[PDB]
Design an enzyme around this catalytic site. Structure first.
Site, PDB file in Angstrom:
ATOM      1  N   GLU A  19       0.819  -1.207   0.000  1.00 20.29           N
ATOM      2  CA  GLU A  19       0.000   0.000   0.000  1.00 20.29           C
ATOM      3  C   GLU A  19       0.850   1.253   0.000  1.00 20.29           C
ATOM      4  OE1 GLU A  19      -2.105  -0.479   3.526  1.00 20.29           O
ATOM      5  OE2 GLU A  19      -2.214   1.663   4.067  1.00 20.29           O
ATOM      6  N   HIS A  43      -0.889  -4.513  -6.062  1.00 17.34           N
ATOM      7  CA  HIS A  43      -0.626  -4.412  -4.635  1.00 17.34           C
ATOM      8  C   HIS A  43      -1.889  -4.781  -3.858  1.00 17.34           C
ATOM      9  CE1 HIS A  43      -3.023  -0.968  -3.277  1.00 17.34           C
ATOM     10  NE2 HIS A  43      -2.916  -0.577  -4.535  1.00 17.34           N
ATOM     11  N   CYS A  44      -1.694  -5.160  -2.603  1.00 20.81           N
ATOM     12  CA  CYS A  44      -2.755  -5.281  -1.606  1.00 20.81           C
ATOM     13  C   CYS A  44      -2.299  -4.404  -0.443  1.00 20.81           C
ATOM     14  CB  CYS A  44      -3.020  -6.754  -1.241  1.00 20.81           C
ATOM     15  SG  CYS A  44      -1.588  -7.811  -0.992  1.00 20.81           S
ATOM     16  N   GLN A  45      -2.369  -4.907   0.782  1.00 22.07           N
ATOM     17  CA  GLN A  45      -1.922  -4.091   1.901  1.00 22.07           C
ATOM     18  C   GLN A  45      -0.436  -4.275   2.151  1.00 22.07           C
ATOM     19  OE1 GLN A  45      -5.850  -5.651   4.097  1.00 22.07           O
ATOM     20  NE2 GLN A  45      -5.025  -3.817   5.094  1.00 22.07           N
ATOM     21  N   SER A  90      -2.009 -10.095  -3.662  1.00 24.18           N
ATOM     22  CA  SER A  90      -1.352  -9.610  -4.873  1.00 24.18           C
ATOM     23  C   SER A  90      -0.299 -10.603  -5.347  1.00 24.18           C
ATOM     24  CB  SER A  90      -0.768  -8.210  -4.612  1.00 24.18           C
ATOM     25  OG  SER A  90       0.003  -8.108  -3.427  1.00 24.18           O
TER      26      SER A  90
END
Length: 149
Positions: free
Chosen positions: A16, A89-91, A97
């Site tokens: 993130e 992306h994710c977190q 991801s």
């Protein structure tokens, strides 16, 4: 934290933090962003600099990510074909991801699930898809080997 991971010249795996780093994204010729969460902002959306896709996965232990593979690969290829890079992306860049990137590598670079995992983990050692996503990647490998995707 870990830095943004180049996977291929046009595919970057990040967290993130990385999706907010506009100077880096511009430097790397990124034009496309995949946000693999239901709840995060599409950072920098209002600047109209990137093309975005949300894959609104939750935190559920039953989250189905396979359902998104086709869509995610098509977007990667769009970037690929017009000479722009894509950030996914994710977190944390650890699980959702990373699963999508491994699956892309499996389909589009013909890598076995083991080799694609090791390719990504070699570039980005913090990755760790959960056993649910690993199970889905094994099923995806199966379906690839029979041509039934």
């Amino acid at each position: 934290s870990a830095e943004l991971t180049p996977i291929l010249p046009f595919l970057f795996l990040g967290n993130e933090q990385d999706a907010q780093d506009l100077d880096t994204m511009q430097r790397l010729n990124i034009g496309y962003v995949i946000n693999v969460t239901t709840h995060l902002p599409l950072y920098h959306y209002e600047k109209g600099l990137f093309n975005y896709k949300r894959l609104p996965a939750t935190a559920s232990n039953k989250q189905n990510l396979r359902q998104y593979f086709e869509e995610a690969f098509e977007f990667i290829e769009e970037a690929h074909q017009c000479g722009k890079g894509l950030l996914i992306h994710c977190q944390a860049g650890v699980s959702r991801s990373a699963t999508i990137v491994i699956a892309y590598l499996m389909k589009h670079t013909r890598m076995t699930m083991t080799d694609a995992y090791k390719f990504v983990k070699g570039k980005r050692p913090i990755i760790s898809p959960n056993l649910n996503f690993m199970g889905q990647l094994l099923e995806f490998e199966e379906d690839l080997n029979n041509g039934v995707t």
